[PDB]
């Protein structure tokens, strides 16, 4: 019981640095994607903004794809190296069988 709980708080010990990749993330997103300023844009300006944002969607998706492709190649390598490393009711039953007993 004590060992099980020990291997429990030694995670409790890492909740602590998950907890940091979250104020992290906060803010890489901070911009890379910054808030829209829409106040004072007229109709034409809004049409152009929508086209600008849509173009940005394309660019960001391409960048995401590139990182994803590297992650995919790492998976293939991890899978290969992983292969290589070791290479080198009683209740009801009792009532029925025994009855009152």
């Amino acid at each position: 019981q004590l060992k099980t709980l020990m291997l429990q708080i030694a995670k409790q010990e890492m909740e602590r640095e998950a907890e940091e990749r979250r104020g992290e993330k906060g803010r890489v997103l901070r911009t890379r994607c910054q808030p829209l300023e829409l106040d004072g844009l007229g109709f034409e300006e809004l049409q152009d903004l929508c086209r600008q944002l849509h173009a940005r969607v394309d660019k960001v998706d391409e960048e995401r794809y590139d990182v994803e492709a590297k992650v995919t190649k790492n998976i293939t390598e991890i899978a290969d190296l992983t292969q290589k490393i070791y290479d080198l009711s009683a209740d009801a039953m009792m009532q029925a069988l025994l009855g009152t007993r």
Partner: protein
């Protein structure tokens, strides 16, 4: 462990043949239903032909409690190995062993550290590799 061990002994002594020592072959499936484990054909067969029956069909607890506590691995030990290996070099050295031992909270003498390392280190390089770790924790 005290809570589980006691509860396995409470169901065992209830479903007795001897008294307080050995229960019957059909009795093994009963006690498993009372605690929390379904006795399927594949489970009953492998429990049968691997962990033996003391007489004809009569199981005893020293061998019963070893198979019942673990059920109700190398992969598991591999993950734990990584936790010892703080510099990620694929070996557990004396410093890493020391750090882990102190983290246990038990009073750790120099003899505790030296003997555990000698116990683990089969090829006398002063560190515990992955294969040595598996034997060490067997």
């Amino acid at each position: 462990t005290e809570e589980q061990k006691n509860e396995f002994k409470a169901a065992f002594d209830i479903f007795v043949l001897g008294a307080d020592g050995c229960i019957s072959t059909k009795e093994l499936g009963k006690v498993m239903r009372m605690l929390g484990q379904n006795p399927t054909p594949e489970e009953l067969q492998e429990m049968i032909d691997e962990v033996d029956e003391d007489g004809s069909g009569t199981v005893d607890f020293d061998e019963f409690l070893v198979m019942m506590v673990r059920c109700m691995s190398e992969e598991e030990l591999s993950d734990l190995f990584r936790m010892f290996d703080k510099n990620a070099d694929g070996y557990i050295d004396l410093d890493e062993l020391k750090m882990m031992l102190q983290a246990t909270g038990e009073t750790i003498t120099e003899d505790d550290i030296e003997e555990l390392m000698k116990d683990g280190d089969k090829n006398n390089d002063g560190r515990i590799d992955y294969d040595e770790f598996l034997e060490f924790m067997k």
